[PDB]
Amino acid sequence: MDVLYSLSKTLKDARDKIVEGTLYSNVSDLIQQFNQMIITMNGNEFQTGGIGNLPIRNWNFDFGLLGTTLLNLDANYVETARNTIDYFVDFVDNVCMDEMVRESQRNGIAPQSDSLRKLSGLKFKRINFDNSSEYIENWNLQNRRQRTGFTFHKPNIFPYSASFTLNRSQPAHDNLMGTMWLNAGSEIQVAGFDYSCAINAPANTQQFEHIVQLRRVLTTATITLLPDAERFSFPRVINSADGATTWYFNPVILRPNNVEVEFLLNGQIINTYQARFGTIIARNFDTIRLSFQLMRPPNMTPAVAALFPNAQPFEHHATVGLTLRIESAVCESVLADASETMLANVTSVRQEYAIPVGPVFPPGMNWTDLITNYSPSREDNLQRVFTVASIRSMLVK
Amino acid sequence: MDVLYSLSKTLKDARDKIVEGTLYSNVSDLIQQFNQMIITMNGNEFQTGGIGNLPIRNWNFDFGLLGTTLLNLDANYVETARNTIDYFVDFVDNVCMDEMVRESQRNGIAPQSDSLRKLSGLKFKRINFDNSS
Amino acid sequence: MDVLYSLSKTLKDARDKIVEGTLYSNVSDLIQQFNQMIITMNGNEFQTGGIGNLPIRNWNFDFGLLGTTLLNLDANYVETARNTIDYFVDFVDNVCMDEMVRESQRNGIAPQSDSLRKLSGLKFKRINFDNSSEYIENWNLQNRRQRTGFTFHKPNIFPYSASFTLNRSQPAHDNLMGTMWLNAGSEIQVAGFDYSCAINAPANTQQFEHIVQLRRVLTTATITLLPDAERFSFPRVINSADGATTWYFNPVILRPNNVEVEFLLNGQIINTYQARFGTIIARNFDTIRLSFQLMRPPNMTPAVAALFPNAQPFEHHATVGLTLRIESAVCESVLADASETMLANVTSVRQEYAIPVGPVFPPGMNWTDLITNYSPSREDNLQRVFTVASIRSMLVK
Amino acid sequence: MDVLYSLSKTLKDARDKIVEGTLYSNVSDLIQQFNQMIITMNGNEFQTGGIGNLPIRNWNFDFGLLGTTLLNLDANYVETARNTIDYFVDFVDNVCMDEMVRESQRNGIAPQSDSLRKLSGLKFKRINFDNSSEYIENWNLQNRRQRTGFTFHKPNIFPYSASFTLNRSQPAHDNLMGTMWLNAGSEIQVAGFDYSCAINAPANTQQFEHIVQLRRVLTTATITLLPDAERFSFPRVINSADGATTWYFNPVILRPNNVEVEFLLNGQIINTYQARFGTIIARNFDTIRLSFQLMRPPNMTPAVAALFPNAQPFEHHATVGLTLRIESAVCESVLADASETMLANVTSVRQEYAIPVGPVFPPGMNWTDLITNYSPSREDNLQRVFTVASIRSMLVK
Amino acid sequence: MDVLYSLSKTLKDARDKIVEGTLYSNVSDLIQQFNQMIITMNGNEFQTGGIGNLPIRNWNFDFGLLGTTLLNLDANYVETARNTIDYFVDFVDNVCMDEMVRESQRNGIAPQSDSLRKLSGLKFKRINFDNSSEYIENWNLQNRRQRTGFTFHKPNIFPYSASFTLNRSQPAHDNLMGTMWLNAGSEIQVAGFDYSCAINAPANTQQFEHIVQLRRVLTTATITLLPDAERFSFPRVINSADGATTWYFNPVILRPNNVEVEFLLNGQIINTYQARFGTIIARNFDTIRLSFQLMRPPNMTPAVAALFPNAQPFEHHATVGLTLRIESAVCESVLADASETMLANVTSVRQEYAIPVGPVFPPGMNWTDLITNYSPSREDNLQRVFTVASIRSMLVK
Amino acid sequence: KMKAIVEDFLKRLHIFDVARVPDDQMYRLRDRLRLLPVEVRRLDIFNLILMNMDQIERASDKIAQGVIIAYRDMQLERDEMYGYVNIARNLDGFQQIN
């Protein structure tokens, strides 16, 4: 595996630092490394593909070295080189792809393909080099077992979930109380509604709460918390819990009262914020708990008083809400986010080559299904597969 | 300060370019830079912590330089190295954190900690490099 | 076969006695043995798999030997070794599995796979060693011929059987007499019931008997025998023998009278115990016979007398029972028990790779079906297959 | 860590292979290893204890080697040796115990004590060897990154849970329908009851279901499945769900109809068994789902018909049940089971020395609490602590 | 004695490591040890038998050695060896068996037979080696004397005892109060019953208690404690204390109230658990005390109220119970358990050869009788006899 | 390690006059030798020497293992056999340079 990495920074730091011009000396340390490779290869034989609509291709090696001679680089030098790189490019592609599809329950971590199982071989280790690529940097540290880590913008930690819970309801659904929400990606929106506007509630206040349990701990999270849930601020006709009928939601929004956000880790409060909207930091948590209340306005102008009668029918439904967005965070486990193309690369290669559903990943690499049951096997396979996608993107985008 | 920087790209471009496999020459310009450091260090002692729940660990130095056993590195070479880096890692952490808390109205744009105030010293400047971050 | 064994204790006593540090002197006698292998190997090519959903990986060999130099292992020594072992590991797995599925009627006791048929070859024998693994220890002794033997906790000798026998019945099922039981694994529970409470029985005693014939002889069995069959001490509605209706069982329990347990071998009483509850030893038997009686209480307090009238309806049904559990025993034939994972390993590998039903084993390696018709062919195949599972578990669990 | 291990197999394979007589050459490879140790040691001082009722014994080293001269050991040789071992014995004990209590939320997987933090030192690794003790065998493979695996018997995967769920109830609790169960250790018993005997149910059949989610996946499980739940086959007076009153349960048992057991992994059915009682194999699962029905008997003798009237009061409560026991299984995570003394050793040492409750483990190392919230930190600490207990048991039981 | 041991690990580590193939090196340290033996032997005449149905085979010794002039063991080498081992096998058997019957009051802890009395001789001690077999490991430590110890799955500490105690009774046995239990092996089930349902009891609570005194201390016990005693949850007709009549028990079960389990050692509470069901650890105890109460339900639905009238007749008998099982534990004294075959081996050899009852052991090696009066003499003889059985099982099962 | 030993070896065997031994042969000869056990006799002795090795070396009259530098007016120690001297059987707390 680490092998694989090199093969690339080799080519990039190659197809990049080698052109009509430049002095030898700025690549001396480079040329060398390169050749070393060629040698180890030549003679050895390979095979890739043979699964689904994936072409089976065989490759051999027998190439010249490099003029460690010349001072400057003449055009002619390049072309006689690019022609030799373009076999490694078109190669690696066919290599990544081959091990970017196979899954395995037991050792879902290690290599699978007849291509790679031969790479981890010892005689090839004579090639590692420059591992500053964020992903490999982390692959290694994970073998030595130590605190790893990645960087994500609008991460994808929440499996899609859009539902409601009626804490007080009746057949006519004309005087409900409960919450409705949307957890998806890096965002949570939750609204608490009370058709009665807490008319008979103690202290004329109805308490609400929304708890979200992350499948993986997030650390160093920068979060935006805002009052109101715009998504649940408009009239809706919704299916009843049993699917037998439909109810009407006609919200009127009030400011959420006594807002308290807790970021917990293993049941312990790590961060707590009381009514603080804007940007807040949650440094280490596996659970978010949002508590907020609807307090019946003690003083109401006529127009307001008219919305909240002492007796039914309750036609304007008092609603309070919150919106929370995780802009960035660090996770010890790989995840999909709003910037990285890893998930899309893996999913795309599998789709393009009609790769059959395997024993580890959900059909279509479905993110919601994956994160909902993010088993150790799925994570090890995902990391292997994401690391390969990142190696591939250094050369092929 | 600039000092501090190096100490890292040193380690990263280190814990990264140093693996069981690469040819020596792909790190000749690197090894060197590294050693240079070790020297300047060994001897001088440091204090970190001394605030809130921040542990006060005392760091002292005493390390041998780096071999060269030609023609790509042998595993044995790595381990005897990683063991020496993991003291600098666990160190720097305790260093950053220490100067990442102290503040000062008047001149709070400069070094504060008993750890860093000693780094800006002159006898250390002999390190700075690869400032592309 | 014996070949196979070595290949493992080789690796275990290897991946175990080889780590950063140790003195050479703890492995001199070991290193050697190892190398010897490598030689015999490389040069020969292998093929494994095919049948069912099982990959066909091809394997080549040509690995350099070791060092007898350093008399104090350096990390570098390990890694250059582990990398060579991890090919044998991932190999053997693919080897065991391949011969852990093929079955054969005629001579289905020897090797089958194109992988193993080549191992029994002569040029390979140059390896065999350290046969202290309980199972191989027994494989050999069986080849030559001698009192083999294994050790089992809560052995699985009784095919599941849960039924009843009505010795006296009538359409209304209001005055029955008979027995009901559950034989399963290492346990037997049997109850004798007499709705009339032996009112018209000679000496007011009803005799009961339960005989269980083992498919294999058990020797050196430690057994728990207790009065009462809790499983048949509660009210039940049961299907009639012909399935046409249901009867009611409303037990009231009395102590079993004149309990006699006989452990017979070929019709001969080897051990006999009269009313002895607790721990008893049955040293060699192929049959268990439990005889017990229901004796109408000669003296009854009013509350008791009320349960047992002189005339029907009989509403409280006098029941006596016994519970017998074989905690441990030795068997000359392999069996499933409550501690060993052999059956589960074989069954699991076959299930995971969608191995088609063969000519020897019942669908799903069903234990009850297997032990019910434990033919010589099934036993020879089971032993081969169990021995391989045990070889595999030395390295892969 | 691995260090620690050696220190023992050193002594065992020592205090065992050294007896008045033996011809030297059975230990040449042994003596050596031994001495090597002594050297590395001598000169380094050690400290242990420092909490609760744990003495703070101090230690020092300065010992003569072991004449490797003689051909046959004379008594005099032994005694001059045993006297040197008994300092290492009484030592290690005080060493294990010291690191068998300290816990850490962050890196609660690595070494803690001032005793061990010094052992992982490099100058010490000159000792490692013979890692065949099932537990170390697994410690390494985990530190290296691979499919670990342990062997058990009547494992302890189910936190104690004994409760019920009334699907149909009313204040008088005279016509209930629901399930009651006991999940504990490796066993599950569940009963479905319907006071009305499905008199008004579609097809006169009431469906039941019991789902149990394991905190860790079990593989290669050998399981006993039997019809009926004896535990719920007798009359009971139970507290109501709200604790305000008590209800009466008067069961009469019928055979469970359409029994289906599913062993699922991440929502997928891995194994499914339809009405198969006896021994079954579940090869890989994190969830067990038991579905069974109560079917009103279509044909009833008078005695049976009398139990099930068309109208209340319902005095005999139709009940169907299942019993499932995991005899053996493999788990990638350490667990308590019915044979290993690890949990008991750790719990016992902590209790004897009045070790204060720490930040990781529940008070008293309570198993139910531990397995209910089996966090990564608790598992890493448990494994460290179990591995040490196993090292200790090689010498001190 | 220790002599005896070697004679085996000699053969096992022999009949196992010696096969067509392997490199000499594996056995160099072994071969040697072996020969050494032969020498010491040859020339000494041995006699075995002379009691009951035990043949009297006499053995002469005149055997060659084992050339060390080879590298790879040729088949021919094996056979010329196996033929010499098969005399030692068939020998040792006849040796173990001979000293596996004789008993002595005075010095029972010592050797008896004309076969062994000659083995403890000095000129033979020249053999002893590799004492890692759990049992010998413990035999030795017992003669120098120290913290000995063993391991048992579901041990056999409780002599069979099934009885009751009526704390309140009258001739009609229509209003009883007391307890009934079953202590057997590693399990205890106890029920407390009060026909009056504590109608006239202080606080409407009836206290119960069950104390069990172990004959030997158990340490590091892993125990399952569950509410309810299924064994005493069904209707029974029982004999009165004086045997003159029979009473009726018609239980209805309630949850045991204020459950408290105490594991005491010499009158001191070592472990105490209040209402904790599931898995608990008892680290060192010689007594178990179970205290539990029946509390009349303060609130009862009609169906429940109907079972418990203010005046007799009391037709439903309130019962509360507990079940306790010792899954595993360590004991300083040998005991029978659910996994080891020692007791069964000793008992079986004596039964097969019609060995007459002796002065130490109860007839038939009856476990209940043995553990009930586990005198020092019985324990020393049992340990000697169990250790021999374990030596024998290394070769003959 | 190379030739040295090999040379003597063959010589004592008489039979052949070394020299005319292809260089591929002599070395290849080592390659094979360096993979065998060792006459318990032979071996058993080396193990012995190594264990005592250390002890001899320091136990000599002329020659000792390294010296330390403190530039810290340091207190001289006293030992019966040498009188007022500056020894120290323990170097710990200062780098080591082989």
Ligand SMILES: [Zn+2]
């Ligand atoms: Zn068991």
